[PDB]
Design a protein around this nucleic acid. Structure first.
Lengths: 111, 28, 358, 103, 96, 147
RNA sequence: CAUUGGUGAGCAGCGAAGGAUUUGGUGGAUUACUAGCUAAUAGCAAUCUAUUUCAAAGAAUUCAAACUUGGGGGAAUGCCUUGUUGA
């Protein structure tokens, strides 16, 4: 469904229609993370200039910070089961309650 | 020119409200 | 007498009859359920479209109706009906012959006041179900404690208590222990309306002479008093979008707006409804919104909106007056003549004794 | 419509909504249809319905590349909660066998 | 400070984590049941942050003669029959 | 003239929009047309309330304010509904000018009250409460003459 | 003498505390009225989170895909197809 690349050319997040976000190493072609069973298929991904990961699944936009890293503690979760610090919960989320988002794009040098 | 008494197009907003279902407690 | 050719379908052209309507809020939208004789009608407050009409006519006139999230509680002759999407879900028969004439719903409790000054509390069975269904207890306001019950409300953060507004007094019941916690001092004139303020533990009382009292239900005092001479007060509403305005509704058909912060009078909408049909019968602010829905006994339901202020620095002192927004209406008098406008049975012309052709 | 006539369902967008059929013997009301349920599990638009032989399960096919089975009533929710993936394109139909064992 | 105490809220004991609305008024992640007066104070602060406290309640409770007479009156002219002589520049004349 | 040339004009000050970047000053009839609005009158009375509160009312301001107020009353002297919209604004600012210490602002309020009472017949009780507010802070001598 | 041409000065007539023309904004209709949100057999609507994770299911030698080109002529270097040499 969607592909985004880091501006360093190192990581690539791809969302499929099988409710699966996947973070890829680009240079060595390893698969870093496989977030399977999203609640609804991720229709967009984007990667900011400082490495945030903005996934959008229809009404919802969800951003993870430090998700494009090698360690398994950077796998983007949706909740921290009992307060685990080694689970990458969303950095921030928003719900566009009326509609379904068409695309995402970070504004280049602003927040 | 006089001041412009024109009406804006009004759209409702998202408001929070206290619901009173938490204002009832049971005894053991 | 039942028929064998024609069967009753609907009674069109009716919007209100001067029972104080209820507002309800699904999510961030609002609906307005108004009584038309023996049925109610649910309207979409963003556009005043008729969503629902109650499925069956009640055996008598609906006299007090409230609305929580999905459910509408309509009290007629003896009993309280709990309705969802028009279709009735439950029927609570009271154990009296007295006519139920007020009700509030908070928590697991539905509280229905009859006209013999008894109050019937009904409880949910398990706190996950949808409406209060089982009988719990009975409360009584005898002649020592207070007069006729004139309103029945629950001001917020009051753990299973009930503010009962009698004609002279304000009682506060604990509806689990069946107790009378606090009875206020008397009031020197008969109070007709009550509305809970969005300020914590403050109710607002409206008397049959012209004054609005702002009673503090925890201190037992009154905070302030607003005097509108020779006007019987029939509605009270509060603005809850960062502008502290009060809207009182006067049975000569007037809607007066007050600033409570700087104690001035913002505006008066005169002849907003007919005095002969009851004046303004229920006026309420949709909360968080600068729009107020009024309804009168002249078969009319209006909305008024506050535009944002015209001064770009002051604002709070230059309050633009409320203007008119959408409204629905019908005949205020029974129609005198009837015709069909076309062969498709789509429109029908209808003339009434109030000298209007709809 | 159901085989037993008493319910009908329809694929409005990506919601399967089941309403229950008004009688022909009853008079016309202001609102004769009474909603049974509205299920939303598909992510794109539903292309087809199929009732079972007993009017007990309903099997819907979507533009989203799956198909789902829903029980009519809430008590058989555990018998019908699966989704059927594996197609490369729009699922155009999903049917039961006569005995409702194969799909 | 208060004009009544009811002596039932102190011995009630509520759950918190059963519904999502009351799930926000905990001060720890180990709180599951709290006392009634504590719970009342939690949702009093929650009510205060839904509807913020205005200034008219705590500001004031109830040479100002003109301001008072203006805040009570609604008409500002002579009424009907306490005139006894004609107002100039605007008649009042119906046609029969 | 300089602040009008460089200003970005608010929507309440709309009638000065033909005197911005112009070589001629706005006229007095333009000032009365500016003051003749009701929202502008509420704005200017709040401005005077802050002036009276922080004790900055000076006599040239009181002269200009009183001149424009009595010209507003004069302009609206032929429609009673505009006079009746206008009464609880200018009588409120008369009460707030009488409730201060300046003899100049007190006799400014005296001027506003005398023009307004001769423009429309006010109520007896309003006139009595007006004379009570006049006498309740009467300390000067020119204020006593005007009072 | 005609204007069945422009601009005015006036009558008769019509005529209830005024009349005419022009214009900006908003609201309601312009299809036939079953309510908002979401991860939907229910929750929420004051909040989804400190259960949102596991399990299962799920991968066509279709390991095929421009039914999508203005006409004539050509295509060094490309690109396509077929064969071929060397690994």
């Amino acid at each position: 469904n969607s592909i985004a690349i880091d501006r360093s050319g190192y990581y690539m997040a791809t969302t499929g229609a099988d409710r699966s976000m996947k973070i890829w190493d680009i240079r060595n072609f390893k698969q870093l993370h496989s977030v399977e069973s999203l609640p609804t298929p991720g229709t967009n991904v984007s990667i900011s200039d400082t490495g945030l990961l903005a996934l959008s699944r229809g009404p919802h936009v969800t951003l993870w910070k430090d998700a494009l890293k090698l360690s398994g503690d950077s796998k983007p979760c949706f909740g921290s089961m009992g307060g685990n610090p080694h689970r990458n919960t969303p950095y921030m989320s928003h719900l566009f309650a009326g509609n379904k988002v068409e695309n995402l794009g970070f504004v280049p040098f602003e927040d | 020119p006089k001041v412009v008494r024109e009406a804006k197009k009004v759209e409702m907003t998202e408001a929070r409200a206290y619901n009173a279902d938490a204002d009832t407690a049971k005894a053991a | 007498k039942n028929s064998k050719i024609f069967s009753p379908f609907r009674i069109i052209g009716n919007v209100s009859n001067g029972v104080p309507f209820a507002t309800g809020t699904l999510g961030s939208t609002f609906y307005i359920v108004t009584c038309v004789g023996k049925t109610f009608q649910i309207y979409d407050a963003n556009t005043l479209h008729l969503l629902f009409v109650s499925e069956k006519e009640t055996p008598s006139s609906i006299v007090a109706l409230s609305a929580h999230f999905h459910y509408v509680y309509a009290a007629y002759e003896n009993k309280v009906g709990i309705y969802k999407r028009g279709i009735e879900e439950h029927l609570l028969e009271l154990e009296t012959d007295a006519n139920v004439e007020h009700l509030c719903i908070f928590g697991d409790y539905l509280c229905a006041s009859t006209d013999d000054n008894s109050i019937f509390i009904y409880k949910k069975s398990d706190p996950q179900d949808k409406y209060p269904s089982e009988f719990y207890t009975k409360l009584t306001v005898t002649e020592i404690q207070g007069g006729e019950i004139v309103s029945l409300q629950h001001l917020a953060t009051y753990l299973n208590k009930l503010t009962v507004v009698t004609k002279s007094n304000v009682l506060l019941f604990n509806v689990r222990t069946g107790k009378l916690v606090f009875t206020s001092n008397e009031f020197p004139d008969q109070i007709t309306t009550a509305e809970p303020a969005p300020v914590l533990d403050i109710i607002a009382l409206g008397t049959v002479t012209g004054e609005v009292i702002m009673f503090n239900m925890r201190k037992g005092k009154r905070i302030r008093t607003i005097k509108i001479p020779q006007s019987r007060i029939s509605s009270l509403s509060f603005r809850t979008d960062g502008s502290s305005h009060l809207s009182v509704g006067t049975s000569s058909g007037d809607l007066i707006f007050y600033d409570l912060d700087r104690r001035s009078r913002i505006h008066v909408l005169k002849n907003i409804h007919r005095e002969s049909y009851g004046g303004v019968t229920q006026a309420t602010f949709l909360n968080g919104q600068p729009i107020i829905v009024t309804s009168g006994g002249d078969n009319s339901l209006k909305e008024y909106v506050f535009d944002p202020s015209l001064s770009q620095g002051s604002g709070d002192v230059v309050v633009q007056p409320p203007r008119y927004l959408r409204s629905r209406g019908g005949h205020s008098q029974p129609p005198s003549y009837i015709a069909f406008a076309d062969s498709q049975s789509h429109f029908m012309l209808s003339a009434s004794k109030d000298r209007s052709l709809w | 419509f159901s085989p037993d006539g008493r319910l009908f369902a329809l694929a409005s967008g990506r919601f399967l909504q089941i309403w229950k059929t008004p009688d022909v013997n009853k008079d016309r009301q202001f609102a004769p249809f009474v909603r049974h349920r509205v299920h939303a599990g598909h992510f794109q638009d539903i292309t087809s319905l199929t009732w079972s032989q007993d009017s007990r399960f309903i099997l819907t096919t979507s533009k989203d590349l799956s198909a789902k089975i829903w029980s009519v009533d809430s008590e058989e929710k555990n018998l019908a909660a699966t989704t059927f993936n594996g197609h490369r394109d729009y699922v155009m139909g999903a049917f039961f066998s006569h005995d409702q064992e194969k799909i | 400070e208060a004009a009544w105490i009811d002596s039932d809220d102190e011995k009630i004991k509520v759950p918190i984590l059963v519904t999502n609305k009351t799930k926000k008024l905990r001060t720890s992640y180990n709180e599951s049941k709290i006392n009634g007066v504590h719970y009342i104070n939690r949702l009093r602060s929650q009510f205060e942050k839904i509807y913020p406290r205005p200034k008219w309640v705590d500001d004031e409770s109830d040479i100002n003669a003109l301001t008072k007479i203006l805040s009570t009156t609604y008409n500002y002219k002579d009424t009907l029959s306490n005139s006894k002589l004609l107002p100039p520049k605007k008649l009042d004349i119906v046609r029969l | 003239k300089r602040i009008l040339s460089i200003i970005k004009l608010p929507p309440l000050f709309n009638c000065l929009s033909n005197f911005v970047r112009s070589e001629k000053p706005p006229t007095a009839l333009t000032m009365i047309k500016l003051f003749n609005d009701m929202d502008f009158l509420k704005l200017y009375t709040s401005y005077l309330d802050q002036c009276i509160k922080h004790n900055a009312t000076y006599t040239n301001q009181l002269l200009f304010t009183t001149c424009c107020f009595i010209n507003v009353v004069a302009f609206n002297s032929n429609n009673d509904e505009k006079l009746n919209q206008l009464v609880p604004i200018l009588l409120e600012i008369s009460a707030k000018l009488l409730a201060s210490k300046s003899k100049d602002c007190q006799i400014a309020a005296h001027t506003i009250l005398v023009v307004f009472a001769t423009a429309l017949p006010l109520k007896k009780t309003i006139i009595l409460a007006a004379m009570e507010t006049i006498l309740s802070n009467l300390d000067a001598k020119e204020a006593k003459h005007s009072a």
